[PDB]
Structure 1
């Protein structure tokens, strides 16, 4: 089974960067619909699977990738945001970032470009290519999970669905992006990075 995880701050710990109304509707509304559906779908799956009904397995795929990723994506997200965040990573993460993107500002520009360029709903991500042994930026449509659809370990995800920023920044997705840099939990991404060189 799956459960909506608790936010490790409250709906306002992120003001003024991401306002309270968004952090509430986002977590308790969207993310919550994902997990119910994930569960409902996984169960409908178990059945189609037992009867070896391939038509069913196939028909349930989209709902399971959308809701599955909906759940994983947002769960990683919540951990990536922290009221005492922002700044620059420190330690190895920064060095890898220096190594892979040239500097932290270039890294910043690139991930902003990637998130700003997804047409429609999607996510911008910094991931770890365990195969090549280096950081990579990817962008995914709708709720497509990063690792699943790509094999990259998600380290940092930026939700660019309009519901992630509409009530506050409106159509101005680059502003929402300027903001999010102040509430990024570098401690956690360093963590997520650390477990990749494990």
Structure 2
């Protein structure tokens, strides 16, 4: 069974960018539900229940047909949110190899930001925007609902190893921003953990 990971900071630690109320509800209610639902479907599947969630989502085709959608949605939700909490932190700065790779692949940091913002704003309905690594090149992509690029192109419509991501479901920003998703996206640049992003970039897997 999966368990809900504890946050690596307090609930008010991303203030004044991301609000304290949302952080608590997003973690304790939304993420908790995905963990609960994934665990429930997994009770009947002992062969898969032992796996790490990031590994389980790359093997959705191996699952039984009646379990596939529920695990794609819930284990996808667990994997995405787990990555999300680790990818947030105040006071980091984009530097080094990651910064150089971004400038190499996007022209400049500003071009990268514009491309990321455009992907994040254009995802209609629920979803996520991602900065992924693929073919030794960085790229910006987006997925629907709780799909991840780790699931592969056939399922998610995208692929590659996620370096960093932004949750664009309405629950992530509604309490503070309401319909103003672009304000939320602009505010995200203040809280992206560049240290963690650099760490994932260095690791590659």
Q: Same fold (TM over 0.5)?
A: yes
Q: Per-residue CA shift, 1:113-156, capped at 9, x if unaligned?
A: 10111110000000111xx1111111010000221134411111
Match of 1:119 among 117, 124, 146: 124
**SS of the residue 1:167 aligns to:** helix
Count of aligned positions: 186
**Greater CA drift, 8-17 or 142-151:** 142-151
Does residue 72 of the first structure (1) align with residue 75 of the second (2)?
no
Matches of 1:71 and 1:25 in 2, distance apart?
15
Matches of 1:60 and 1:172 in 2, distance apart?
36
Aligned partners of 1:65 and 1:145 also within 8 Å: no
The answer for the alignment partner of 1:192 in structure 2 is: 200
5+ long unaligned stretches in structure 2: 48-62, 154-158
Match of 2:175 among 164, 167, 177: 167
Give the CA deviation at 1:40: 1.0
Aligned partners of 1:68 and 1:145 also within 8 Å: no
State the TM-score, normalized to the length of structure 2: 0.86
State the TM-score, normalized to the length of structure 1: 0.89
Report matched runs for 1:7-156 at 5 Å.
7-46=7-46, 57-85=64-92, 87=93, 89-129=94-134, 132-150=135-153, 151-156=159-164
Give the CA deviation at 1:46: 4.5
- Max Rg structure: 1
Does residue 157 of the first structure (1) align with residue 165 of the second (2)?
yes
| Runs ≥4 residues deviating over 6 A | none
Matches of 1:44 and 1:149 in 2, distance apart?
25
Matches of 1:44 and 1:120 in 2, distance apart?
32
RMSD of aligned residue pairs (Cα, Å): 1.7
Give the CA deviation at 1:99: 0.5
